[PDB]
């Protein structure tokens, strides 16, 4: 690869990072949006204050302001639901390691409550909160309210570093490798500039997903992250081996590969910065389907990319990977739902099933109440869109199990529900081909009525090829499509995926059967479970 290819393509100008004039040819429309006006100015220069005052019908009359609300606002975690909930915004947080408080939960509930039938909230596949129903005029007050309770929504969408995922059992599991919270906290603080905004990492060629591993279970899905920190001792020192470039897209799904790099634990932020700077400086900015970091790694080769990371490290030092990491390959992924003892004697955590991750304001208040009465006011989110309430004095468990709300958010739902994951789908998402959340619950309920089983089969439902619900990791995955019934009528369907494995022995699933009408999935799935997963007809 020629030396000219390694010239940084962006430069700092007045606090922000912009494409250099000579690298602007052939760029995609999103890159043009970023050049036309720096999205971070909406927050960092309080551009949102005046924008929020303009009636949305007027906003839609000019490209600049329409791009503000449809594109640039995603840098403030605000997502206009133009097609399916016009004039309303989904709002997405930074929530490193999935950790929330009862006060934060009540605040979020109070926001969605205002919007009535237009409001609700969702736990995401990055153990994060999304709230719904937000109107533009309310945005300045919501931003203030979030800050007041110690939350940020910065840089959660578009060409930004996404929610830092960690071990949902961090600090509490007797079997953890290393508490991931300090590291995911540091990453989030770095990414968001301590909630003020960090323009140095907000003009990436594309989204970028990080995780820090602290579990033998690999709850963090390191194989599908742009950067995964794998805990590893090297030459008597604790640190992390680095995996890079994992991603899913409509066009291509790839597992992360070794960078062949180990960093001491204190270098977590420095190496995150170095990798992001290399991606920012050198990444392709044409066809959006070829802008994820793995495409850069393929273009330079992993060694060429590694050299770019190395030159951006303090003292330009980057050690090679440790021959072994601390993750034990002899491991069975553990169920976290139900009551489990913590490493702190006399304390338990409880995992509660949240059906397809969907909650209303009243539900959130009740969960916050439980966390206060039984725990320490902490609620943890998981990437299967469930919750854990930690730090419960074990003597309180008997009373907790009798709480009425646990009939809805159960510590021991049927096994197929335990593993069920579903994206937003067409209730709110404009890209969705099908409805996902209600359908997946209905189908799963019918399937489980017909068969019993003991294997923890994981079913993932995603509404379009963006695969936000990660169908390629599922035992049985369902990707939304339109198909045809026996009479040739248009019906909702799914492409069915098999072969996904998680944990250390990970594998990406692939399409098994295309174009199955959703109304025909129950018998197909029942038979798959009996024939391949040991299920028994009732
Ligand atoms: C909420 C969530 C799914 C869920 O129900 O949990 C979600 C929802 C959306 N995703 Fe995603 N993605 C979610 C995790 C993912 C993941 C899974 C992951 O991170 O492990 C992926 C696949 C992994 C990956 O990115 O490598 C994913 C791949 C995408 C893509 C395809 C990326 C690509 O390279 O092509 C898009 C479209 C895009 O970015 O161009 C997308 C775009 C979208 C948008 C923002 C599209 C839009 O604006 O409507 C969706 C918002 C719908 C809504 O109203 O909720 N989403 N999205 C997840 C939020 C995570 C978070 O808290 O930050
Ligand atoms: S997979 Fe498609 S339908 Fe589901 S949330 Fe992502 S973009 Fe929307
Ligand atoms: Cl986005
Ligand atoms: Cl839309
Ligand atoms: K769930």
Domain at 457, CATH number: 3.30.413.10
Q: What gap in Å lies between CA 477 and CA 470, rounded to an integer?
A: 8
**Residue 271: CB within 6 Å of ligand 1?**
no
Nearest CA to ligand 2 atom 4: 463
Does residue 126 sit in the same domain as residue 256? no
**Residue 163: CB within 6 Å of ligand 1?**
yes
User: In this structure, is the dihedral angle defined by the CA atoms of residues 208, 211, 217 and 223, taken in order, positive or negative?
Assistant: positive
Alpha carbon 264 to chain centroid, angstroms: 26
Nearest CA to ligand 1 atom 1: 124
**What single-letter DSSP state applies at residue 334?**
P
Q: Which residues pair with 480 in a beta bridge?
A: 494
Nearest CA to ligand 2 atom 2: 464
Residue pair 310/318 in contact (Cβ under 8 Å)? The answer is yes
CA atoms within 13 A on the CB side of 238: 8
**Residue 92: CB within 6 Å of ligand 1?**
yes
CA dihedral 426, 432, 433, 436 (to 10 degrees): -50
**Residue 292: CB within 6 Å of ligand 1?**
yes
Reference 382, options 500, 503, 221; nearest CA is: 221
Ligand nearest to the CA of 209: 1
Question: Which of 297, 316, 335 is at the close of a domain?
Answer: 335
CA of 79 to the centre of ligand 3 (A): 8
CA angle 337, 389, 222 (to 5 degrees): 65
What range defines the domain where residue 492 resides? 414-538
Ligand 2 first shell, C-beta below 6 A: 423-425, 429, 431-432, 462-464, 466-469
Does residue 344 sit in the same domain as residue 433? no
Q: What gap in Å lies between CA 197 and CA 156, rounded to an integer?
A: 11
Atom from ligand 2 closest to the CA of residue 425: 3
Q: What gap in Å lies between CA 249 and CA 284, rounded to an integer?
A: 16
Residue 134 is part of a domain; what is its CATH number?
3.90.480.20
Specify the residue for token string 């979030």: 146
Question: Which of 312, 335, 358 is at the close of a domain?
Answer: 335
Q: What gap in Å lies between CA 205 and CA 455, rounded to an integer?
A: 41
Kindly state the tokens that stand for 331: 């491991």
Nearest CA to ligand 1 atom 16: 468
Does residue 27 sit in the same domain as residue 113? yes
Does residue 141 sit in the same domain as residue 158? no
Alpha carbon 9 to chain centroid, angstroms: 28
| CA distances for 74 relative to 42, 187, 460, angstroms | 10, 19, 26
CA dihedral 207, 150, 394, 457 (to 10 degrees): -20
Does residue 299 sit in the same domain as residue 341? no
Reference 203, options 191, 195, 194, 214; nearest CA is: 191
The angstrom resolution of this structure is 1.3
Compute the radius of gyration of the chain from its Cα atoms: 23
Residue pair 385/437 in contact (Cβ under 8 Å)? The answer is no
Atom from ligand 2 closest to the CA of residue 469: 1
Q: What gap in Å lies between CA 79 and CA 90, rounded to an integer?
A: 5
Does residue 54 sit in the same domain as residue 37? yes
Does residue 265 sit in the same domain as residue 406? no
Indicate the annotated binding residues: 81, 124-126, 128, 130, 132, 206-207, 209, 248, 289, 292, 385, 423-424, 429, 464, 468, 470
Reference 234, options 334, 307, 318; nearest CA is: 318
Ligand nearest to the CA of 430: 4
Q: Which residues pair with 237 in a beta bridge?
A: 234
193: left (phi over 0), alpha (psi -120 to 50) or beta: left
Relative to beta strand 378-381, strand 358-359 is unpaired
Residue 414 phi/psi, 5-degree rounding, is -55, 150
Does residue 404 sit in the same domain as residue 451? no
Relative to beta strand 88-92, strand 78-80 is antiparallel
Reference 401, options 356, 346, 344, 339; nearest CA is: 339
Q: What gap in Å lies between CA 283 and CA 296, rounded to an integer?
A: 6
CA atoms within 13 A on the CB side of 196: 5
CA of 239 to the centre of ligand 2 (A): 35
CA of 124 to the centre of ligand 5 (A): 9
Choose the residue to mutate in 357, 432, 474, 479 for probing ligand 2, maximizing ligand atoms within 8 Å of C-beta. Answer: 432
Indicate the annotated binding residues for siroheme: 81, 124-126, 128, 130, 132, 206-207, 209, 248, 289, 292, 385, 424, 429, 468, 470
| CA distances for 292 relative to 62, 211, 244, 246, angstroms | 30, 16, 11, 9
Kindly state the tokens that stand for 515: 């174009």
Does residue 401 sit in the same domain as residue 419? no
Number of domains forming the structure of the chain: 3
Which residues have CB under 8 Å from 494's CB, separation 6+? 434, 461, 478, 479, 480, 481, 516, 518, 521
Reference 434, options 483, 377, 489, 493; nearest CA is: 493
Sheet with 421-422: list strands edge to edge.
421-422, 459-462, 476-484, 490-498, 510-517
Residue pair 472/500 in contact (Cβ under 8 Å)? The answer is yes
Ligand nearest to the CA of 206: 1
Does residue 129 sit in the same domain as residue 194? no
**Residue 181: CB within 6 Å of ligand 1?**
no
Does residue 144 sit in the same domain as residue 204? no
Q: How far apart are the first and last CA of the chain?
A: 62
Q: What gap in Å lies between CA 424 and CA 419, rounded to an integer?
A: 17
Q: What gap in Å lies between CA 375 and CA 378, rounded to an integer?
A: 7
Atom from ligand 2 closest to the CA of residue 432: 3
Specify the residue for token string 């990798």: 275
CA angle 250, 483, 491 (to 5 degrees): 120
Residue pair 268/183 in contact (Cβ under 8 Å)? The answer is yes
Does residue 289 sit in the same domain as residue 254? yes
Kindly state the tokens that stand for 510: 């692939």
Atom from ligand 2 closest to the CA of residue 480: 3
**Residue 430: CB within 6 Å of ligand 1?**
yes
Indicate which technique resolved this structure. Answer: X-ray
Residue pair 413/445 in contact (Cβ under 8 Å)? The answer is no
Q: Which residues pair with 88 in a beta bridge?
A: 135
Residue pair 446/486 in contact (Cβ under 8 Å)? The answer is no
Question: Which of 381, 413, 445 is at the close of a domain?
Answer: 413
Determine the longest span between alpha carbons in the chain, in angstroms: 68
CA of 31 to the centre of ligand 2 (A): 22
Nearest CA to ligand 1 atom 53: 429
């Amino acid at each position: 690869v020629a030396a000219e290819r390694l010239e940084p393509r962006v430069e700092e100008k007045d606090g922000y990072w912009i494409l250099k004039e000579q690298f602007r040819k052939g760029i995609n429309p999103q890159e043009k949006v970023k050049i036309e006006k720096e999205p971070m100015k909406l927050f960092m220069e309080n551009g949102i204050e005046e924008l929020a005052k303009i009636p949305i019908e007027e906003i839609d009359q000019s490209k600049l302001t329409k791009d503000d609300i449809d594109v640039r606002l995603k840098w403030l975690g605000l997502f206009h639901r133009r097609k399916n909930q016009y004039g309303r915004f989904m709002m997405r947080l930074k929530l490193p390691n999935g950790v929330t408080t009862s006060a934060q939960t009540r605040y979020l509930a109070s926001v969605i409550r205002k919007y009535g039938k237009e409001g609700c909230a969702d736990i995401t596949t990055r153990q994060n909160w999304q709230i719904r129903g937000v109107v533009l005029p309310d945005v300045p007050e919501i931003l203030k309210g979030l800050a007041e309770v110690g939350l940020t929504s910065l840089q959660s969408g578009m060409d930004n570093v996404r929610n830092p995922v960690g071990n949902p059992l961090a600090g509490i599991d007797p079997e953890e490798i290393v508490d991931t919270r300090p590291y995911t906290n540091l990453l989030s603080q770095f990414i968001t500039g301590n909630s003020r905004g960090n323009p140095a990492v907000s003009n990436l060629p594309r989204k970028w997903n990080p995780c820090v591993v602290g579990s033998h279970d690999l709850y963090e899905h390191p194989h599908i992250n742009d950067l995964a920190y794998m805990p590893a001792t090297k030459d008597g020192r604790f640190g992390f081996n680095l995996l890079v470039g994992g991603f899913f897209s409509a066009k291509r799904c790839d597992e992360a590969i070794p960078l062949d790099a180990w960093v001491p634990a204190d270098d977590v932020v420095p190496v995150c910065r170095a990798i992001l700077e290399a991606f920012r400086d050198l990444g392709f900015r044409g066809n959006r389907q070829k802008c994820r970091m793995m495409w850069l790694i393929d273009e330079l080769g992993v060694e060429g990319f590694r050299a770019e990371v190395e030159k951006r490290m303090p003292q330009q030092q980057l050690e090679r990977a440790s021959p072994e990491d601390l993750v034990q390959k002899q491991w069975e992924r553990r169920d976290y739902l139900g009551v489990h003892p913590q490493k702190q004697e006399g304390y338990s955590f409880i995992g509660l099933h949240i059906p397809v991750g969907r909650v209303q304001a009243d539900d959130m208040d009740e969960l916050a109440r439980l966390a206060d009465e039984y725990g320490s006011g902490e609620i943890r989110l998981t990437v299967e869109q469930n919750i854990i309430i930690p730090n419960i004095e074990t003597s309180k468990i008997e009373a907790l199990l009798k709480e009425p709300v646990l009939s809805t958010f159960s510590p021991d739902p049927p096994i197929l529900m335990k593993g069920l994951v579903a994206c937003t789908g067409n209730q709110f998402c404009g890209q969705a081909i099908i409805e996902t959340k209600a359908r997946s619950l209905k189908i799963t309920e019918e399937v489980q009525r017909q068969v019993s089983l003991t294997k923890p089969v994981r079913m993932h439902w995603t509404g379009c090829p963006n695969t936000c619900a990660q169908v390629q990791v599922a035992d049985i995955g369902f990707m939304g499509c339109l198909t045809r019934d026996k009479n040739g009528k248009t019906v909702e369907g799914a492409d069915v995926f098999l072969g996904g494995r998680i944990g250390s022995d990970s594998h990406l699933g692939e399409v098994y059967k295309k174009a199955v009408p959703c109304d025909d999935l129950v018998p197909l799935v029942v038979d798959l479970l009996v024939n391949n997963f040991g299920a028994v007809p009732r």
